[PDB]
Design an enzyme around this catalytic site. Structure first.
Site, PDB file in Angstrom:
ATOM      1  CG  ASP B 110      -0.208   0.107   2.535  1.00 17.45           C
ATOM      2  OD1 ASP B 110      -0.795   0.624   3.505  1.00 17.45           O
ATOM      3  OD2 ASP B 110       0.959  -0.332   2.604  1.00 17.45           O
ATOM      4  CE  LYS B 162       0.613   1.711  15.677  1.00 20.74           C
ATOM      5  NZ  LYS B 162       1.536   1.754  14.534  1.00 20.74           N
ATOM      6  CG  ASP B 218       0.312   4.194   5.093  1.00 18.88           C
ATOM      7  OD1 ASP B 218       0.434   5.356   5.525  1.00 18.88           O
ATOM      8  OD2 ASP B 218      -0.383   3.320   5.647  1.00 18.88           O
TER       9      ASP B 218
END
Ligand SMILES: Nc1nc2c(ncn2[C@@H]2O[C@H](COP(=O)(O)OP(=O)(O)O[C@H]3O[C@H](CO)[C@@H](O)[C@H](O)[C@@H]3O)[C@@H](O)[C@H]2O)c(=O)[nH]1
Ligand SMILES: Nc1nc2c(ncn2[C@@H]2O[C@H](COP(=O)(O)OP(=O)(O)OP(=O)(O)O)[C@@H](O)[C@H]2O)c(=O)[nH]1
Ligand SMILES: Nc1nc2c(ncn2[C@@H]2O[C@H](COP(=O)(O)OP(=O)(O)OP(=O)(O)O)[C@@H](O)[C@H]2O)c(=O)[nH]1
Lengths: 406, 360, 407
Positions: B110, B162, B218
């Protein structure tokens, strides 16, 4: 002879009436000048044949409750006793637990009154219907709006014999226009189903509506008696204002010396206004409709008071506007301060009235209601409290709008 | 080389489009997202690539065996019967990537970029470690796997997917060069390549970062899809200016297929791409929109920041704004206002949509 | 000889931005398992030469305050006294009112500490900077975000000599990104400007320490800064105390490694840093996620999921409940399959050195979604969701509440 049982609650039933209940118990909150159960004791001692008045609750006997009990015993020429149940026993479980004390002396029948209702208490006419028919349960019913009746206990009756055929405590769907009023007349035989209920619990806490009224509905025991005199519940701290307004409207018949008259050298009075004699009201202070003033209340000049309760020892300095509020005990509202609320009555015949839920918020927004000030709240000068609840002993410095000030 | 494209499956972000045509096959600026990857791989000098499919391999595999003979590289395929995620097909293709002692490209399906394959592999052999990834700078690094890149060499000190504490600012660009020794390390049990493979890589000093040149995005969400086509038409304005159709009534950068037509008195506003076979009537104003294959936009419409999928019929006097995605073959009636409408495939809209909703 | 002064507040000045409790005093609220001022007292009693610890506030002497004083005196073998003011005297007025008690024994210096901070407390580092410098006011300062610097006391320093040149207490526009941490080293001459402020008023004895003594004596060679890099937070909100709990349970890994909860695979599954009291009963099927602090006498049933929560003493969580981002008050009961959930007030993770914003319980007339507070002796029924709510003490609920303040 007869007797009355007023089911006062305990400290958990006063949680919904919280800003006000922090200081006094809920049944002793002054509604139109006298405590909430003194309207009940007034209406019960007016009946010929009243021996005893028995308050059942799980409050501990503190100083205000026992001083109220002695004052009621002197003022109403009756023995007013307080039966403290050992546990929260529900509505009927305290009547069954105290049946030896209720039936002591063998009364012909006894009244059972919820302490949280405001009514005219048509006890004489209920007694006329009972002495005509002689059934175990006589209920008082009112007519409600079809939409508002879902907030209450609905009663489907038979309009010729007046027998309750169906009872539902809070139906999701429409059942009937008749709602229970929390006023009942029991004969001694009515303590025999409750025993049965208690025995079924052994395979102590009996809820009267869910276990006795809903079970024997249609079997011949439970009957209605209808009215449409004044009726209100008092659940939240701001339904005390609607109860106060209804009581101040019926003082035009029962106690017209409680209502204050204009008397051109005094404060200007619109509508029904109760003023205690110890209160000092300045002659430019116009006291609008449905206001009640506690004792020791110094109301300054130019004070506009409309649709409010000002409790004992509070002080409204000059040029204040107090609308749809409850000023707590000892609260001081400085000059040009505006304490404004929004009228929100229970009113079961009003099709726009709210459900009186325990959630005061819709989605983060405090719903507009009566502005409650707790005890000892100092509202500063030139400041607006709008649709707010202030918790006790809070000295403010700022304008507050649609907020609970903890 | 070998090149492994883990091609996703079920395409949940960017769902109204992927409910008909898989995410490697939805045309991003008039050719599919996988096609940009594989033409840049055919220009890179990769000898044959393999793509790790798990969902809708009928239309996908038929497209790959179509263009296997057009790119001139064997577009081999790893089928899966259940999804293995992001480090599972690393271990399924253990033999088919362990045959040569040569590095291999691992590409997100992507990400759309201005890829630097030569820079990435010939940065890779300068340190020769187990893995060398591409990194890019971004303004909200709490959504993407961040790295800590040191000075002038680029050793990955730490790697967290994250950060949540704001360790650093650079992020995974979604392209890696992996050495064959990392193949046999992990097992066929499905897991994440980022949580466990790279975080144990960084403990050794075998992960590396190459700083990108720029234009990374993306396209998972339709908002990211439209921001990415903005940046891709910007890259075409910089590099190949004749590809963009500009004319008299054209405003800004417009990429039109030759088969697509456009009427008079219309204003095809900035950063618009029209896919193949569409037919645009007279009097429209289309800005920041992508219009996919053979779709129709009738007269006097106003479309802004929206995706019109395959064989949709946007009616007359129709307003659409606020990332309104239409799924395949959606008919919008006349004079309707759609603000935010994600519309499911094969729906006919007959009411206005005043707030962002999913219509099914 | 050194001593320490902890400025604890009082009953009204707490002004709880979103309440941690209702019935215990705010200094005695357990952050990471122990009361909020016991972190200060540990840090002060670690300092060599520290003789006494004074708590200045205007709380009346209740029983928890006295028993905490006795517990701290017994645990650290220091005098810990509570000097109560006759009125709220402000941040410097209590220092000036009690200056004979503060300066008895002739200390070399005294640390002034705000009660509602979570800090590394580098008291020896400030002490060494001051023993080298010997100045009237030394301040600990941190580095703030540019947007969030407006909520603290901002400091324009001179970076060569470390001297405060300008001080604004709570500005409306940006003046600096150095902020006052609330930790001060005072010389025994620093009481001599405080007198001056008092004598400006008498021409009772309220002195704002930051607005009268710091804002007006900066640039005069009197105030100096000590910049620090450690953990620092303000504890005002409930989410501010949960953040302080996370910071302190992080610092427990190298100061109190005995205080954390290990796995012990006969017992409860521990993720992250967890404090459990030794007297708490935690069933082995209960998994206790990161940043959980369990008080004494807490009963935790089977399958309880606790994540980012403070469970105060005596509280009972029955089986299969999920408590996330909440402060289950003391003696509160959560029944079977009930879910007590709150929203985290997390710092902006895209930005360097965002400290914390403390929610003010109402943003623009709307209630803010934040930490769920259960008051003391609150009963949650079985199979009920409490979401972003404050339940006031002694209240037995019966249904699921969402974004309320249940009185
Ligand atoms: N004795 C006493 N103590 C008080 C009084 N008022 C507050 N305190 C205590 O003194 C400390 C100062 O708090 P505040 O006055 O409410 O201000 P602040 O928002 O905390 O700001 C101060 O500390 C910040 C660090 O968190 C600094 O950023 C700021 O510069 C200032 O020093 C707190 O612990 C408070 O409980 C009082 O009247 N008397
Ligand atoms: N003495 C006594 N009185 C009670 C008790 N519980 C309720 N009451 C009284 O009876 C009234 C009934 O209140 P609720 O218990 O809330 O019952 P309800 O009015 O039928 O409404 P629901 O809450 O839906 O059941 C209260 O307002 C009190 O006046 C009790 O445990 N002991
Ligand atoms: N072959 C294959 N690739 C996968 C699979 N699952 C994830 N991937 C890849 O894993 C990487 C990260 O996935 P995402 O960014 O979340 O994209 P996605 O797989 O389409 O999933 P969503 O956008 O979240 O619906 C992408 O390159 C996907 O192509 C899978 O099951 N099979």
């Amino acid at each position: 002879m007869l007797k009355a049982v007023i089911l006062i609650g305990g400290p958990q039933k006063g949680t919904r009436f919280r800003p006000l209940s922090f200081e006094v118990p809920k049944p002793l909150f002054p509604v139109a000048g006298v405590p909430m159960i003194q309207h009940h004791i007034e209406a019960c001692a007016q009946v010929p044949g009243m021996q005893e008045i028995l308050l059942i609750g799980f409050y501990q006997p503190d100083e205000p409750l026992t001083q109220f009990l002695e004052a009621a015993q002197q003022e109403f020429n009756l023995p007013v006793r307080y039966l403290q149940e050992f546990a929260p026993l529900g509505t009927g479980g305290g009547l069954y637990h105290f049946r030896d004390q209720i039936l002591a002396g063998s009364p012909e029948a006894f009244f059972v009154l919820n302490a949280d209702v405001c009514s005219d208490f048509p006890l004489s006419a209920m007694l006329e219907a009972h002495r005509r028919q002689r059934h175990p349960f006589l209920l008082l019913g009112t007519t409600a709006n079809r939409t508002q009746s879902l907030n209450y206990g609905c009663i489907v009756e038979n309009p010729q014999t007046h027998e309750v055929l169906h009872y539902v405590e809070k139906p999701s769907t429409f059942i009937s226009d008749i709602i229970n009023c929390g006023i009942y007349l029991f004969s001694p035989e009515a303590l025999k189903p409750l025993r049965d209920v208690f025995q079924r619990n052994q395979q102590g806490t009996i809820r009267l509506e869910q276990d006795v009224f809903s079970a024997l509905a249609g079997q011949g025991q439970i009957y209605v008696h209808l009215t449409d005199g004044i009726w209100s519940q008092i659940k939240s701290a701001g339904s005390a204002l609607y109860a106060s307004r209804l009581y101040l409207s019926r003082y035009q018949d029962t106690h017209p010396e409680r209502l204050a008259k204009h008397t051109p050298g005094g404060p200007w009075i619109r509508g029904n206004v109760y003023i205690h004699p110890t209160a000092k009201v300045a002659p430019s202070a116009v006291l609008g409709p449905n206001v009640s003033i506690g004792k020791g209340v110094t109301v300054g000049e130019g004070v506009r008071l409309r649709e409010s309760i000002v409790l004992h020892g509070a002080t409204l300095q000059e040029h204040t506007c107090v609308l749809h509020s409850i000023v707590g005990w000892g609260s001081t509202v400085g000059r040009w301060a505006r304490v404004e609320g929004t009228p929100s009555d229970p009113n079961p015949n009003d099709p726009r009235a709210r459900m009186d839920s325990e959630s005061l918020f819709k989605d983060g927004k405090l719903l507009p209601a009566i502005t409650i000030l707790g005890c000892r709240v100092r509202i500063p000068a030139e400041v607006l409290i709008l649709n707010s609840i202030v918790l006790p002993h809070k000295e403010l410095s700022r304008s507050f709008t649609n907020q609970i000030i903890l | 080389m070998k090149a492994l494209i883990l091609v996703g499956g079920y395409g949940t972000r960017l769902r109204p489009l992927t409910l008909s045509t898989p995410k490697p096959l939805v045309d991003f600026c008039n050719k599919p997202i996988l096609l940009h990857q594989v033409e840049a791989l055919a220009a890179a000098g990769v000898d044959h690539v393999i793509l790790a499919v798990s969902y809708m391999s009928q239309v996908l595999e038929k497209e790959m065996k179509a263009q296997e003979q057009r790119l001139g590289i064997r577009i081999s395929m790893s089928h899966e019967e259940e999804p293995l995620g992001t480090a599972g097909p690393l271990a399924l293709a253990r033999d088919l990537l362990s045959e040569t002692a040569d590095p291999f490209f691992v590409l997100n399906s992507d990400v759309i970029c201005d890829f630097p394959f030569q820079a990435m592999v010939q940065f890779h052999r300068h340190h020769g470690q187990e893995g060398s990834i591409l990194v890019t700078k971004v303004e909200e690094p709490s959504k993407y796997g961040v790295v800590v890149c040191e000075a002038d060499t680029g050793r990955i000190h730490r790697f967290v997917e994250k950060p949540q504490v704001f360790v650093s600012n650079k992020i995974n660009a979604g392209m890696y060069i992996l050495s064959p020794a990392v193949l046999q390390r992990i097992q066929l049990q499905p897991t994440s390549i980022e949580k466990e493979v790279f975080p144990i890589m960084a403990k050794e000093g075998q992960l590396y970062a190459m700083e990108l040149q720029g234009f990374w995005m993306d396209i998972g969400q339709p908002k990211d899809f439209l921001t990415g086509m903005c940046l891709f038409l910007q890259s075409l304005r910089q590099k190949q200016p004749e590809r963009l159709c500009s004319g008299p009534g054209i405003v800004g950068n417009v990429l039109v297929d030759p088969s697509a037509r456009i009427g008079q008195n219309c204003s095809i506003g900035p950063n618009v791409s029209l896919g193949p076979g569409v037919v645009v009537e007279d009097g429209v104003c289309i800005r920041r929109c992508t219009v996919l294959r053979d779709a129709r936009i009738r007269s006097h419409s106003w479309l802004e920041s929206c995706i019109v999928g395959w064989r949709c019929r946007v009616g007359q006097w129709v307003r659409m704004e606020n990332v309104t995605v239409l799924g395949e073959d959606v008919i919008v009636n006349d004079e309707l206002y759609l603000n935010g409408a994600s519309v499911l495939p094969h729906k006919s809209i007959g009411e206005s949509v005043p707030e962002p909703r999913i219509i099914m």
